[PDB]
Amino acid sequence: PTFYRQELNKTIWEVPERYQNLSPVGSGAYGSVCAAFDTKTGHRVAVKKLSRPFQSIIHAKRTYRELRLLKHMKHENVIGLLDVFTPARSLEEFNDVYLVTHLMGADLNNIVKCQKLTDDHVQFLIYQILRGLKYIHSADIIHRDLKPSNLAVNEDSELKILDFGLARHYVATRWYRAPEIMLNWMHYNQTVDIWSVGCIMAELLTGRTLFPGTDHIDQLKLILRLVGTPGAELLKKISSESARNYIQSLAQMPKMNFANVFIGANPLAVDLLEKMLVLDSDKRITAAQALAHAYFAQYHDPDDEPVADPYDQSFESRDLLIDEWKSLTYDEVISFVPPPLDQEEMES
Numbered sequence: 239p240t241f242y243r244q245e246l247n248k249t250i251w252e253v254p255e256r257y258q259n260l261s262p263v264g265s266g267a268y269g270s271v272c273a274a275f276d277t278k279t280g281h282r283v284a285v286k287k288l289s290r291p292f293q294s295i296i297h298a299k300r301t302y303r304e305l306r307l308l309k310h311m312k313h314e315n316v317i318g319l320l321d322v323f324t325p326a327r328s329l330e331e332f333n334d335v336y337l338v339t340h341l342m343g344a345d346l347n348n349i350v351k352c353q354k355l356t357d358d359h360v361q362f363l364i365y366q367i368l369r370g371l372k373y374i375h376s377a378d379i380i381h382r383d384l385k386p387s388n389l390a391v392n393e394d395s396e397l398k399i400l401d402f403g404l405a406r407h408y409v410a411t412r413w414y415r416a417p418e419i420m421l422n423w424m425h426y427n428q429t430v431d432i433w434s435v436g437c438i439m440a441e442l443l444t445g446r447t448l449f450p451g452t453d454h455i456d457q458l459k460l461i462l463r464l465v466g467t468p469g470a471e472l473l474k475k476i477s478s479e480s481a482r483n484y485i486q487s488l489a490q491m492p493k494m495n496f497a498n499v500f501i502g503a504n505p506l507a508v509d510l511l512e513k514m515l516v517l518d519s520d521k522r523i524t525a526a527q528a529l530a531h532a533y534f535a536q537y538h539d540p541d542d543e544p545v546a547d548p549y550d551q552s553f554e555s556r557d558l559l560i561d562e563w564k565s566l567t568y569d570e571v572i573s574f575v576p577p578p579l580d581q582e583e584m585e586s
């Protein structure tokens with residue numbers, strides 16, 4: 239393919255002539271993104287140029303991790319890959335990676351901000367998050383920082399999870415993070431992401447942020463006002479003695495009845511929130527359990543809530559040299575097989 243160069247976000251992008259009319263639509267994890275027109279299929283796409291993908295061992299492994307993850311993700315509510323390209327003619331020239339997915343014009347903050355959402359619409363939005371989570375969780379992938387700005391939404395409210403499974407080694411909002419993550423507790427499971435869904439769903443229903451804490455301690459106090467003081471068993475999870483002593487010394491608070499917090503909400507929504515917003519991560523509902531909850535009865539379809547193929551994450555434990563990660567990434571670029579344009583069939 240013939241490539242062309244265009245300065246976007248103050249830097250030169252080099253892309254195949256197939257992709258036209260690039261215009262910036264914001265930053266993503268470790269890269270910046272442009273919307274484009276795919277002249278091969280007439281579809282609108284989003285193209286992410288990774289920033290400094292091989293500058294250090296941290297960047298190089300992050301680049302491999304992201305390409306491996308995105309090549310594996312094949313679910314209608316999870317960002318996946320239509321294409322991956324590099325202007326490099328060989329590994330020796332290889333220093334830039336571009337990832338291509340379907341264009342999603344908005345994030346969840348664009349949906350709720352200026353819109354009084356109906357309950358049926360909230361159901362659809364949360365249903366899609368949970369369907370995507372069941373899939374990624376089934377591959378032993380956790381998001382860990384799920385929030386409205388990590389949920390891409392298109393013009394018809396179709397939603398995809400992105401920026402999951404990233405980070406190993408800019409000020410982000412922590413309002414949606416699971417307490418065990420925000421506070422660095424010693425163990426956690428996939429249901430960290432279900433806490434985040436609870437926080438998102440609460441805000442879609444009320445129009446107000448659930449736990450808008452000014453710092454870690456203020457946020458914890460807001461959380462405890464809703465869910466009540468935890469038992470000594472929860473302290474088991476917290477390494478820092480100072481943190482445990484602080485929590486233990488707080489004046490005891492009762493759990494609130496969520497029916498008195500989400501006044502006027504669908505009682506089924508309140509019940510689901512009660513099951514998601516639990517401090518005990520072993521008591522928190524899973525994504526697959528939540529999809530069966532009566533709140534989603536008009537959307538639930540077991541035939542269309544798939545799990546993922548096994549995902550080999552053995553590379554995560556390995557320390558390799560920059561050029562090894564780079565060569566592995568080049569291999570993944572070259573071996574990528576674009577999916578069919580139409581991968582779906584009418585149901586039954």
Ligand SMILES: Nc1nccc(-c2c(-c3ccc(F)cc3)ncn2C2CCNCC2)n1
Nearest residue numbers: 263264265266284286337338339341342345
């Ligand atoms: N508009 C849009 N549409 C789809 C995805 C993205 C996208 C990607 C991304 C990931 C992989 C890929 F291959 C291509 C793009 N990373 C961050 N974003 C965000 C850019 C602005 N915030 C919401 C989405 N942006």
Ligand SMILES: N[C@]12C[C@H]3C[C@H](C[C@H](C3)C1)C2
Nearest residue numbers: 447448449460463464499
């Ligand atoms: N957002 C809220 C924070 C705190 C807990 C609960 C009820 C009140 C006090 C408002 C949610």
Ligand SMILES: [Ca+2]
Nearest residue numbers: 538539542585
């Ligand atoms: Ca169906």
Ligand SMILES: [Ca+2]
Nearest residue numbers: 580581582583
């Ligand atoms: Ca079809």
Ligand SMILES: [Ca+2]
Nearest residue numbers: 314394396582
């Ligand atoms: Ca479609």
Ligand SMILES: [Ca+2]
Nearest residue numbers: 539541585586
């Ligand atoms: Ca069916």
